Each structure stands twice: as structure tokens, then as C-alpha cells.
Amino acid sequence: HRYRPGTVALREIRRYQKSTELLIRKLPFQRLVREIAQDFKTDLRFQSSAVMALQEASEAYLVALFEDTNLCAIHAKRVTIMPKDIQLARRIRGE
Amino acid sequence: HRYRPGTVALREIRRYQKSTELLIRKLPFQRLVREIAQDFKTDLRFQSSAVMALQEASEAYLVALFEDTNLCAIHAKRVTIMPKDIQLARRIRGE
Amino acid sequence: RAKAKTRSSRAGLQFPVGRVHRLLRKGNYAERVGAGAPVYLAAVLEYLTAEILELAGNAARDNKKTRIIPRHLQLAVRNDEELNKLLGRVTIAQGGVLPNIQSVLLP
Amino acid sequence: KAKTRSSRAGLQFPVGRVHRLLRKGNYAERVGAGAPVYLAAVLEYLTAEILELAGNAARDNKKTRIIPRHLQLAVRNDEELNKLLGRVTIAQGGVLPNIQSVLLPK
Amino acid sequence: KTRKESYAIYVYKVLKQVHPDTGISSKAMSIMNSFVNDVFERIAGEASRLAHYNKRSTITSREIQTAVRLLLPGELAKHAVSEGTKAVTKYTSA
Amino acid sequence: KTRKESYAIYVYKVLKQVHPDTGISSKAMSIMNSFVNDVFERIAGEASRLAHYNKRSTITSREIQTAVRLLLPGELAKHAVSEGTKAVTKYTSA
Amino acid sequence: RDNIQGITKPAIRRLARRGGVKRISGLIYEETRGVLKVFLENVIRDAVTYTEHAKRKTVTAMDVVYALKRQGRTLYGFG
Amino acid sequence: RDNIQGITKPAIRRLARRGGVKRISGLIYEETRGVLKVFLENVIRDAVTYTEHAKRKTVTAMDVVYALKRQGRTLYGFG
């Protein structure tokens, strides 16, 4: 007994559009932030609350960008996204 | 002796992209601005420079919108612009 | 000396008046400040807060709950046209998104 | 003998006027003694940087005076100055020439 | 330690006035505090700029009214203006 | 009538240094005069904001330097900061 | 009172040619006129409010510049 | 010290399924990973400058809020 391509994706969309959890992991993101911050100074010491704010802002920005690129992709009679759509959306937005 | 379609449009683009002036006539724009302003208040008198400033801002806005619409149109494997492109370009930026 | 009467009681309000006056004076917004500006500002702020809180509380009753959590605030804010226009570039922590799917991906 | 403060700092921009504008603009309640010099120097540097490119662009067209088209050409053609002033419309400026490669006839 | 001020009691009183039986958590209080602060800052800054632009140095009710009419979009603004006027009248009464 | 003040001779003095054989027109002069006020207002506002942030009431050189570093992007910041520091040192030397 | 028709057709063509196009359909003009009217209404209202506050009857370009800056289309060359 | 590999493929898939996408190609992940770094650097540089100006050796959660505010993305909740 096997499903067909298209159903479990809709089920996943419905399940994930009704929650307020956090998707990305914590420790890799914290390590990435603490490594990126190394290029401007030395021996910096982060608090225990800025990382959460950075994570929230990054997640919101990525979600908005993905929604816009999906709209731009479906504009052109297609159901798939390729980097051309992302580049065009970024160019049109103003970035 | 005739010109195949397309040449005159390119000539016009080249001619009009290398000069600075005002395209729309003055008196109809003045009448439209006066009517729109009178719609909100009665016994209103205008100076001589506000009309010019409004005209300049309007021209710049329309030119920018048309350029963005042309880019969105050439995205989807076409040469002719249609109202769907204008609507999508307005929607993406946020208005 | 007579008994003290709080300035908020005279105007029939709930938000404080003296605190707003002191904040306006000490924030070097202008050289001098009149008298009715704190009253006007307090009234406007109270009206806006009451409207938003009433909408959020009305929205929060559907889920068969009693308390209020930021999800209800986001749901109430994003479902009103004028409030959505006002807060056009504001992100709320742990807010989520409204359920919405396109009309072409459906079977 | 009175000597202007601009002469002491070796700057062509005024110093007293900037100080008075800073004090009377209710930006803060106290203003330091050495504040205006930094602002004067920065403004002078920015003005010189813009004017050099403006004149260099204006020299091309076999002309002497400067018209706003030359200023628009100088501002748009640079990278960082475009980022700084990518949020301003200049009256009587024109548009940078560019045609997409697809529309060309072949 | 030092003392820090907030807008908790007034918000709770308004909530009790509107809805009789309804609780609240800490995150909602923080969000309400931040929103109130942001709106107050915006309105006060706009009023100060408008008052300065006309070569006069005083902030009175007219500047606040004009700033409110300029900022708030649509029907909302209308309602707000009316409310404010009533309050001032009461202060004039007593 | 009444006196109106604007930057109209300092720009010409600066222009007479980089290029000694070039004049300017009226509209370009007006554009250049209007350009300076925007930068001045932006820098002054950022400096006032930063000064107010740290629970202090004073404006000095460090706040202006930090505002200049924050505002100007790209590569102009280094040259601008160097020129400002040199000018401040020269004035302090007296 | 149909002053909106004074914009006429060839002006849109000239603007499009300046922007850069090679082919235009037959339904663009209505949308262009609607967009222009929508923009002008907001700009005019914002300009009118300022001169209403100052107790004056004549509108000056200074107020228009101020409204354009407040909404934000910063314009240079008009004081 | 390669840490950009921490963001993996199923994480991107989960993050994508909130706008309504239904099919995912094979080259989106690299572009997203390249995009994220620019935003992170842009925020972090301003946050570090704000922290440095106050003569401190730690980053408060408040500086990040005023770092985000300047660009045009406010954040309610942390103060």
C-alpha cells in the first residue's frame, strides 16, 4: 500500500501551517552565529537572549522570501521553484 | 518604400532616452489637479510651482513602474506587456 | 490644605496623566509644553489599547481557552484591515501565519 | 586682532553657523566645544568628492557650465554614491541609457 | 536594586473593564508595553516636528490633533479625534 | 525685505580649487545647497539619539564619529574619519 | 467634468518608450489612469492638510515637498 | 571551521513548507545558504558597533533590537 505523489505534501503543509514551534536546530545556529561574529572583534561574549531574537528574525525573513518566490514561480505556469525566481524576486523587491 | 515593424520603435527609444523634458501637456494636468484639490475643499488657490513639482514626481513614478513592469514581462518568455504583469509587479513590492 | 485629588479622576480616565506630562517634558521634544496635550494623548492611547485588547479577547474565545497568548494577538491583528495597515512592518514573536493555500495546487 | 575659527582649522566651511544651528535645533541640551569641526570637515569632503566627478563628467560634452543632467550622470555612474543617494529624485535628470539584449534585432 | 516603570496595572484594569472573566500571560504584557511605547514615541515626534516647522516653540492640543489626523489611517482616526475632544471638555467643566 | 541664509559662496570657493576653469548654473547651485541639509539633519539626529541612549546628556566628538561610521557605507567612511580626526587634532594643537 | 480623459493616449506611449518597451497591448491605459488617480488623491490630501493647519488659503510648493518627504519620495531642487 | 553546513536539507524543507510550496528543485539549498550569510553579517556588524561604542565586552539582547530597528524590521517582545 503506497500513496501517490502530491498527497503527503498537502498533509505536511496543513500540519505545519498550524503551529508556533521552532524549526531550525539550536546548537548549530548558535555555533554559526558565534563563528560569524569572530571576524569583527575577538573573545566576544554573547548573552543568553540575543541568539533567540536573531533566530526569530531569520526565520521570519526566510518564510516571507519563500512565499514571495512561490508566488513569482506560480505566475509563469509552473509548480516548481528554481533560482531564477529567487533572483527576480530579490531584484524587484529592491535589494 | 516601407519599414518592417520594430525598427521605428527602437529609433524612438534611442531618441527619447537621450533627452530631458516634460512629456504630458500642461493645461489638462492643471485642470485635473485643480478638480482633485477642489473635491476636498472650496475656494482653493494654487501657486505656480506646486503643479510643476507634482508633475515631476508623477512622471518619475510612472517611469519606474513601467520599467519594473517591462522586466516582469520579459521574465515570462514574451515581448508584449499585459495588465497581469502590472498587477503582479504592484503586488510584489507592496502597495 | 484640602485633600488631594488625582488629575486622572477629574478627566474620567484610566491611564496616568502626570507620568505622560513628565515624559513629554523631559524628552526634550520642545522648549515648552501646554496643558491639554497629556490629556489628549492619554485619551487616544486608552482608546487604541481598549480596541485592540477587546478584539484580541473576542478572538481568543473560539479555542475554548481562558487566558491570552501571542497567537491570539496575531490572529486578531492580522484579520482587521485598518489594524493590518497600521502595523505593516512589525514582527511578533511566536506568532505563526494565517492558513492560506493557492487555488492551483489543489487536486 | 580677531581671527575666524575656520582659518585656524584650515577649512573652507563655516564653523560658527554650524555650532549655532546645532545649539538652537534642540537636538540635545549641551554641545561640546570640538563638535562642529568634525561635521564641517565631513561635509566639505563630501561636497568636494561630488564636485570632482561632476566636473569630470561635464568636461566630456565640450561644454563649460554644469547642468543637472551632468550631476545625474555623475551620481548614477558611481557605486557607493548610488547606494547613498538611491532614495532621491533629481529634477530634470533623465535616465541612464540601457536596452535589453533580447529585444535587439537578429 | 533600582526601580523600573511599566504599563501593567492600567492594561489589566482596561482588560477587566472590557471583559469580566479573562486572564493574561507575561508575553502579552510585554507586547502591549512595547506597542504603547512605540505609538507614543511616533505621535510625540510627529507633533514636535510639526510644531517646530511653523517658527513657533510650544506644544498644545492643535499639534496633537493634527498629528493624530495625519498618522492614523481611515475611519479609526475619526473616532479617536472625537474621543479626545470630549475629555478636554470635562477638564474645562471642573 | 528680510535676510535669508544659505550656502552659496562656500560651494563656489570649493569649486575654485578642484577645477579652476569651470563655472556653475543657478539650478545646480540650488540642488547642491539642498543636498547638504539632508546629510546634516541625518547625522545630527543619529548623534542625538545615540547620546540619549546611554543615559547621558552631552554631545561630543565620539558620538559624531560613531554616527559617521554607522551612516556612510562602503569605503568613504575610512577617508571621512581620517580627515575628521586630522582636522580635530590640528584645531586642538592651536 | 471628465478631466481624467485629458491625459490622452500618446502620452502613455511616450512614457513607455522612455522606460523601454517594444510592444503594448490595448488595455494598459485604463490601469495606468487608475493608478495615477490613486497616487494623486493621497498626495493631494497630504499636501492639503498642512496648509489647512496653518490657517492659509494659498498652497505653496513647500507644503508639497513636505508631504512628499513625509510619505517619502524625497525631491531636490525646490527649496 | 566550517559551520555553514549546520543548516541541513530537511531543515530547509521544513522551513519552506510554510508559504505553500509543493515541489522543491535541486539547487535551492545552495542559494538559500548563500543568502542567509549576508543578512546575518549585516545585522551582526551593527550590533557589534553598538556594543563597542558603550565600552563593554558583552552583547546585550537590547542592542540587537535597536540593530534591527534601523533597517526597518521592528521586533516586539524582548523590550
Author numbering:
A (entry chain A), B (entry chain E): 39 to 133
C (entry chain G): 11 to 117
D (entry chain C): 13 to 118
E (entry chain H), F (entry chain D): 28 to 121
G (entry chain F), H (entry chain B): 23 to 101
Manuscript excerpt for this entry:
On the other hand, MPO monomers stably interact with the nucleosome acidic patch without making concomitant DNA contacts, explaining how monomeric MPO binds to and licences NETs to confer hypohalous acid production in the extracellular space.
In contrast to the datasets of the 2–20 min incubations, we did not observe any MPO monomer–nucleosome complexes when we incubated them for only 15 s. Instead, along with the free nucleosome and the MPO dimer–nucleosome complex, we observed an additional, distinct conformation of dimer–nucleosome complexes. In this conformation, MPO does not contact the acidic patch, but binds to the nucleosome exclusively through the DNA, mostly by electrostatic interactions between arginine residues and the DNA backbone. As we observed this conformation only during short incubations, we propose that it represents an intermediate state that transitions to the more stable MPO–nucleosome arrangement mediated through acidic-patch binding. Thus, the first event when MPO encounters chromatin might be the binding to DNA, followed by recognition and binding to the nucleosome through the acidic patch, followed by DNA displacement and nucleosome disassembly. MPO might first bind to chromatin through weak and non-specific interactions through the DNA backbone, before locking into the acidic patch after encountering a nucleosome.
